Amino acid sequence: GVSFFLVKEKMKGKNKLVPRLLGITKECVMRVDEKTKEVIQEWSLTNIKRWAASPKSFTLDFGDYQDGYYSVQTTEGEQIAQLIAGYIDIIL
């Protein structure tokens, strides 16, 4: 895929928000490192229960696939949501 969103993940360990490349494809969602450009973690679209599209932060609810959800800071939150729903529209 080429559709990647620049998001910032707030994890513990440091107060610095980590720049992440949120790869939204017609088949999966991959977390690519912004500087290393490597894929850390990838999810299937079929594991999407819901998502929260806010103008400052975006949250992906993978349900019972892992502990908690995936929340990242980005102004492209709705763009992400729209794109996921777009790819999902192709499968759905």
Binding site: T46, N47, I48, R50, W51, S54, A81, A85, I88, I91
Partner: peptide
């Protein structure tokens, strides 16, 4: 009754 119309999008391929 707690709605989540805006912000929360309910997808239907969560198997």
């Amino acid at each position: 009754g707690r709605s989540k119309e805006s912000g929360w999008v309910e997808n239907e391929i969560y198997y």
